[PDB]
Amino acid sequence: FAQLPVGFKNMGNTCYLNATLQALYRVNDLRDMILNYNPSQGVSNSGAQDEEIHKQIVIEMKRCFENLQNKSFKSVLPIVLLNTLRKCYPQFAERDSQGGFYKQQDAEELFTQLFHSMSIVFGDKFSEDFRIQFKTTIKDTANDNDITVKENESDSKLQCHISGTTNFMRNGLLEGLNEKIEKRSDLTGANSIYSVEKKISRLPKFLTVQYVRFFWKRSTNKKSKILRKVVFPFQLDVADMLTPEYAAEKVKVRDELRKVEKEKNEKEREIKRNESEKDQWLEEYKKHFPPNLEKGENPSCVYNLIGVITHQGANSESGHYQAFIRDELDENKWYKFNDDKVSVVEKEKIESLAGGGESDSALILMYKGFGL
Amino acid sequence: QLPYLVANVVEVMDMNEIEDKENSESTTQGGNVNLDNTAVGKAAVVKTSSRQTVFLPMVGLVDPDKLKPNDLVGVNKDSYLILDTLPSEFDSRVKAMEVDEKPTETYSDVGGLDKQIEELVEAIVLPMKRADKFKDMGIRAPKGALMYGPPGTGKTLLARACAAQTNATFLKLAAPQLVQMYIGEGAKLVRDAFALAKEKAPTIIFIDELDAIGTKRFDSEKSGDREVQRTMLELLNQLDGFSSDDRVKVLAATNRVDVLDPALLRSGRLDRKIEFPLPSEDSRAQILQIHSRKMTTDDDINWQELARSTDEFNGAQLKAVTVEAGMIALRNGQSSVKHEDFVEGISEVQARKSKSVSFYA
Amino acid sequence: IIKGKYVINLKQIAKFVVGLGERVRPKDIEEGMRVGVDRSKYNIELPLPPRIDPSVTMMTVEEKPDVTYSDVGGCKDQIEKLREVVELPLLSPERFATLGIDPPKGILLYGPPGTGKTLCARAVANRTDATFIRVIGSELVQKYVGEGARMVRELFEMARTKKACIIFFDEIDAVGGARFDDGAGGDNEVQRTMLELITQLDGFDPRGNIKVMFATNRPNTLDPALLRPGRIDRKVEFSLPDLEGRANIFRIHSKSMSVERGIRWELISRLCPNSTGAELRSVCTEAGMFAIRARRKVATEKDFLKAVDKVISGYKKFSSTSRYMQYN
Amino acid sequence: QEEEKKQLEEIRGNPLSIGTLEEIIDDDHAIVTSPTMPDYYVSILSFVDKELLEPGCSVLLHHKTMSIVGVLQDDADPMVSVMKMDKSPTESYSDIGGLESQIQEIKESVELPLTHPELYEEMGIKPPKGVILYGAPGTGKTLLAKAVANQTSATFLRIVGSELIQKYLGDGPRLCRQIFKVAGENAPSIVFIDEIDAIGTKRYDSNSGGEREIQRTMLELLNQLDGFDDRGDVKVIMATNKIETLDPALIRPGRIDRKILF
Amino acid sequence: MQIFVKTLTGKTITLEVEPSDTIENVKAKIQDKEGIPPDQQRLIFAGKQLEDGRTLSDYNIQKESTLHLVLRLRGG
Amino acid sequence: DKTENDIKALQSIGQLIGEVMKELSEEKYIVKASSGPRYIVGVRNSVDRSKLKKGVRVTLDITTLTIMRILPRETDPLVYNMTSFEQGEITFDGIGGLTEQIRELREVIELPLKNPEIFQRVGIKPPKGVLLYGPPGTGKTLLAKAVAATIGANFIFSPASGIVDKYIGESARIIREMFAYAKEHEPCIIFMDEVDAIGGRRFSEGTSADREIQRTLMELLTQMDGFDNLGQTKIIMATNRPDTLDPALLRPGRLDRKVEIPLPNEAGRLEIFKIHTAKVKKTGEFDFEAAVKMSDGFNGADIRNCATEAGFFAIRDDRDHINPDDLMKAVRKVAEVKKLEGTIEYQK
Amino acid sequence: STRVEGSGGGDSEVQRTMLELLNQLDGFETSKNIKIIMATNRLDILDPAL
Ligand SMILES: Nc1ncnc2c1ncn2[C@@H]1O[C@H](COP(=O)(O)OP(=O)(O)OP(=O)(O)O)[C@@H](O)[C@H]1O
Ligand SMILES: Nc1ncnc2c1ncn2[C@@H]1O[C@H](COP(=O)(O)OP(=O)(O)OP(=O)(O)O)[C@@H](O)[C@H]1O
């Protein structure tokens, strides 16, 4: 089932790093790449000398991960990484004014900057794993008198735009890849309104979805957080935001994978009344994966939910990050990482992290292609 | 600014304008010359939702003409002074009546029962727009329109479709909603459905089902149906003139017309009586095609063959034949919906599985 | 909602003007939405879901049992039709969009009592992995009427808030049977909640991903206003087990039973006439009582003979042996 | 004890202001409605075990700003007094002596599975469920049930058949619904429904007793006894001697397994 | 060079900014019209955060692009 | 100054209304506040003792609890909607054919109203009380609007069930306070309108609602007959079937005359046809007499739906007139839809 | 006014509850103290289950 995982203790004002890390090493290729680092790993030049600080971040993750796998331990130290982060980006070394130490911020940003480092060092074959490509059509409302297609628009993570139309994540994602882009230059006139639709033409192999959870009240001129129950399913099917081309092929493969998945879901319960069984289902699945597989491709459009970063209490500028991650051998058995305080939690605890109230709610949701 | 209690005005009673040597009060006091003895000016008694009443000399920024003797005003909760005037409040249940941007289905996504569509448009929709031709001719406009007949004939659908199309305000009301265990609070749903309705006129008060208030009975011996009917008797009070029933309308659908009270038979209440018949041969064909508009189908089907094999069907059952075609279709494994599957949704689902027992017939 | 402050009714009954505090959009605040406002001066602190009247609908939301699909109330295509109406369009709307049809949401579950009509729906409840809310039809009746109109309505709109849920209307043979006016009786007060069950199913907006099940012991008396084929659409009768269908059920019942080989389950079906699979569920336990008198850890063929003989004699002694409760 | 109670009393009163738990929210808050009529959106201190409290629980709120200080398990209603015993049925086995062949169908399927699940692990399948007693008056039917529940010491609810029928409607089935929720809450459970021939021969007024009431109560009882609930093991013991006041969904077996004639 | 900026509420507005301008200028022009200060603003393009000391064409962002605005948070 | 006036009102405080329940001494009074509970209070010198009587509304202070001044009678918010009902007014003869019932109505109502003195010679109890009953649609209420307009006396009027509250005996107090208001008012006409559920019998094998009926009914009996006997304030009671009523609401000597207004006669339909055809345009139509008589079934409200339906046949032809070619298809059609259910009633 | 065509007295319905408890009251804590002295106008206008 699972060992008894270890956590990171704080140095004081340290959970903003600890909580987020747990989730990153859930991601399969992410944990592999750092583990297998050599001094033979390259870089990508286009202008930056920050590529050698990028290397330094990668050794500290490797050994932080090494403590995690070892059980001679009850505390993972974050300590050399913290200095190395502050060196790499010196906006965390700003003083908090009538607060505490060297500045603390932010699960979203954090992943962005660590992923920047990793994509340089581990090459572009790793860059593509999270990178999402769209087909964007910027097209007139009434008859098109100008068209431009941008496939140079990209993201590496999707943005669920909470409009208060969020009752489910899928809704706001689907009408957050629909937006209206206003112009200002005579293309058919200055300020002509264009309907814009992004549809996905390439899914990543690892999907990351960030909630927008913030509002700037213009009615008090002060920032706030808003929360609100936005349900995310365990099984996310994103079929309807793809282009037709990419979808038909992923949905055909998915139906065979559902049959093996069904035989698993019966069989798992029987024998109870794990790693070896897992390996047999993986072997069965890969036969049905298409022979066009490459880095950064999902052989389904179905994902399962493997991690939640949570944020609690009052308005933004405030957070106590714990994180929850799902087991690597089990799928109803999840570990709660409250810094070095580790506990087993259930599926019901996971559902409640959709927010409402004034405590723990999702900010970042981590997936991986199909289920386990 | 907030916060401040919201209260109702008992009355305006008004003490005389302060220019007198002898108080300023209607009800005169003892002692010779007064002005600010215990003489104060214009007076309003307001009654609170803090369950009392207070006599105040009220603010003179707001007129005793901007004070009705039942008007909803702010009262300052720190110390009871009529602060300002606020809109009249209706219940949240009555605030659920108005549209969400209610989808239209015009008269052209309702196929079959053509004569009914024309009879409804005549009763409700055109007396609103051409009320001018009604005044010049000199007729009155009707007080509501009854819809009655078997379930599945599109009564509920039509009302939504026609209300949205001219965008006469579609007030959304369920008959059972009026029936509440709180007495004299169910009756305020009836009253504010008209208080709202005249502001939002031209308007359609759609009570879906008429049978929860509409009872045959109104002499009821030894039952608690005397609380239920009190949302029915208060309903007929507002379908008698105080004017505002000439642009304020009523639609009613009901499945059984034989349980209605005889005061809903009569004109000035429900005036026009459209019966919704069970579709005929041509009519059925139309209805089937309106569902087939949405779905992929075979082209070798003929809607007249389909009209032969149905005998005494109505539109709900023809919903149950177009959808049933696609059940048979998926089960074969075919993308399209076979022209044999339309014939086989009639027999598979009628509204009953075979024609019943036979043992000597 | 007053366009730019709001009029709230406290739960103190006292009405006040409040506004937006320090973390709320105007977008957040709807009509009929509850708000938490600061006790000392009333201003919107935190928006809250609509309506604290539901509290006795929080006893009717329940968590799904673990019952494998493999265990079935009989092996037929009949549970496969249930799998086309409820189950498959939840997992894959891909096929129901290509057809271009709107999935059927309704179904009737009907036939003689005790076949496992709810047994095939508990199997489906483990399976769909969509929330189940279960309803009792004689828990919708209370001394003051109009209280029960309120209860019914709030439960249904709560399923409209949800997406991928199933409301299983159980035991609507009392409240959900056909309406009829007495003229002296208090039957009218009961007919009120029947009408509320009709007007929620259709709505003024169509169902927002509500699959509807009706569990009826009887098809014989049900309301034509709930039996109309536009909200119950395809309805699959789960009828009595056969000579083969009874063997199939009894093969599951005797699989779960520690037994010794040499048994005939085909024989048992011969011995029983068309009779419930709850009869066959009690063959095994009464055979387990003849095992225990002898002191065994196993059952054999013989003790199934005696068990079957006992249940059959009691059926004669009573009524409902194949009965539908007459008619069609 | 001493240092733990220091910080126990810190967040406790003075007044402890009982609430009624309407609904939980999962962030450590709930919406309570008090008996004194103001609502509170309460917190939860998080030492009383956050999710161990459910609708219908009675909650201790603090004298200042309301946190769920703690939670009371049990609050004695006079409505579960009726079911619950106040006397011990001192006549047990062999004071109803004789009918020693019709006591092997209530102590080989009611008493004995609870005493020994051992014998029923051996056969496997689900243990016996329910019995119906009937026969001529004065065969000890009423006392048999009280005599097997004395010895097991399982939770003995006993409800009379003539209290299910009230001259008030709709609160009849709510009473019957209560009885089985208590049974499922108490793992070893025997519910004696004394007299359920007193549901088809007994009626009051015609507007709140009568036929409609009789239909409703019968149906409530099916859901309770097994229905869809999947509740804790309840043995049901029914005294009756008019066996057509009972549903054709209740006198099929697999809810009531062996039937007892006296 | 014309770019588009997607706000918190799924609303795309226009911005005219040069290929030789720092991200401090982008956040400055956005601070005018939203009332939001630069130190809370996070401009994303291609999944990468756009740091203030690097310019717009260090991330290879040229016209007809859409940047995504989200706001920070603090603590620890 | 409009804002200066706002400051002088804002800096004042409210006052709390009571009524003088009982004199205790002479400088201390028992009042029953409108907040509820009784208090013992003192007085300002500005109020005189002999203008303090019982049932007189007083101010109190809200921080000293002292009478500063006598206040006019309090009056219901509800009864100010009731004087705003007289709309739907019509002429003296505004129900055709039931004209014989108007004459019969004024005997009881208007002849003692102007002069109670012609009844002094006669020596009888002043005529008080009227019951109206019929099959709906005959203008029992339309008549009430005519006898409010024509006489021009103070008029009230009652909603059906909006004077039924959620408090038992608070729904009694309201109707009590409209009678008081109506006795302060000169020659007041009091219409109870569609009393059918607010006049029920004893029941109480029902719900708790039927005890609200019963509390509220008892209030009427004391008012009608006790130490109030009305001679200038008049009661008119409108009901849709007069055996919905408890027999103390069918008791004459509280209801001296019980007037039935029937369904319009064969040629009482005709009398409405001549007045409603002057309310429309026509090319000329004086050929009613046979056709309406033999398309009988109508009530008085259905005569004006034949008029409106002749304006629908007109709309087909595209006319802004009523032609008798339009009308006689109308009277045929209005009659047929009314065959839907009877109106069978058996009256005393 | 319907409860004596209902079951022959609705009081007799409550009485049956009383009396059914009473079947074990001679031993619970030793020996009846609570006598249920019932009374009626004739003994023939009681159901024969009493
Ligand atoms: N004449 C019709 N043309 C088109 N479709 C129809 C027609 N009548 C019914 N339908 C289809 O059947 C559905 C259900 O019927 P609907 O609920 O509208 O009818 P009803 O007569 O008001 O009955 P109920 O009051 O029981 O709901 C409609 O929403 C529509 O899809
Ligand atoms: N075919 C069967 N296989 C196994 N057990 C069954 C079967 N049918 C019935 N049972 C038993 O009966 C129990 C209760 O039956 P259930 O609640 O499933 O009834 P139903 O078919 O809905 O009929 P009713 O009209 O009596 O409600 C089940 O939980 C199970 O123990």
Ligand SMILES: Nc1ncnc2c1ncn2[C@@H]1O[C@H](COP(=O)(O)OP(=O)(O)OP(=O)(O)O)[C@@H](O)[C@H]1O
């Ligand atoms: N076998 C027996 N041995 C001892 N006493 C018995 C036996 N059978 C019955 N009795 C006595 O007979 C009386 C009535 O029997 P009991 O109340 O137990 O149930 P019953 O068969 O439902 O009859 P009823 O309710 O009409 O009295 C009791 O006092 C009981 O002790």
Ligand SMILES: Nc1ncnc2c1ncn2[C@@H]1O[C@H](COP(=O)(O)OP(=O)(O)OP(=O)(O)O)[C@@H](O)[C@H]1O
């Ligand atoms: N006698 C009539 N002559 C002309 N119009 C009538 C007549 N009766 C009713 N109407 C029309 O119908 C409207 C409503 O009828 P009204 O409320 O006056 O009837 P009612 O006999 O008092 O009925 P109920 O007994 O149900 O209260 C009137 O305002 C009027 O427009």
Ligand SMILES: [Mg+2]
């Ligand atoms: Mg409807």
Ligand SMILES: [Mg+2]
């Ligand atoms: Mg059932």
Ligand SMILES: [Mg+2]
């Ligand atoms: Mg007994």
Ligand SMILES: [Mg+2]
């Ligand atoms: Mg009237």
